Amino acid sequence: MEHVAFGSEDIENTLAKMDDGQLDGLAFGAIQLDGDGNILQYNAAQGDITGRDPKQVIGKNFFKDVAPCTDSPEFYGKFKEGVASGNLNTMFEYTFDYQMTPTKVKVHMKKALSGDSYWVFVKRV
Numbered sequence: 001m002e003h004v005a006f007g008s009e010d011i012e013n014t015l016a017k018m019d020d021g022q023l024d025g026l027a028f029g030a031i032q033l034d035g036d037g038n039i040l041q042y043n044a045a046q047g048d049i050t051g052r053d054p055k056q057v058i059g060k061n062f063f064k065d066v067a068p069c070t071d072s073p074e075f076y077g078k079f080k081e082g083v084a085s086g087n088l089n090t091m092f093e094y095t096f097d098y099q100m101t102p103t104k105v106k107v108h109m110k111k112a113l114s115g116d117s118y119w120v121f122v123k124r125v
């Protein structure tokens with residue numbers, strides 16, 4: 001277990017050092033996306049919340065394939081604007097309901113430090 005708090009201001013600095021194994025020790029869900037929304041990293045805590053098997057979703061498109069309920073101005077729209085503007089830091093509540101029991105979460109999206117990557121952080125509410 002990696003001690004990093006959800007919403008920490010310098011979270012992107014902290015997570016740049018972690019490899020996939022250590023991401024799996026976080027207390028919250030973490031997804032790393034490229035600028036097109038393809039999944040690069042998906043941790044164990046996220047799979048505990050959504051039921052997905054982390055290794056099976058890496059490489060899939062989050063908005064088109066895995067999470068169609070986020071294909072909306074309120075989620076996807078915010079991501080696409082942040083990728084265009086090159087800056088992103090927003091937190092909101094959302095409900096995940098595709099092929100799963102409707103689950104309410106807090107979502108934190110933030111630009112990664114390295115190049116064209118973006119974090120999606122999730123915890124239950």
Ligand SMILES: *C(=O)/C=C/c1ccc(O)cc1
Nearest residue numbers: 050067068069070096098
């Ligand atoms: C809506 O379709 C949400 C689905 C979803 C959210 C987060 C994930 O990791 C997987 C599925």
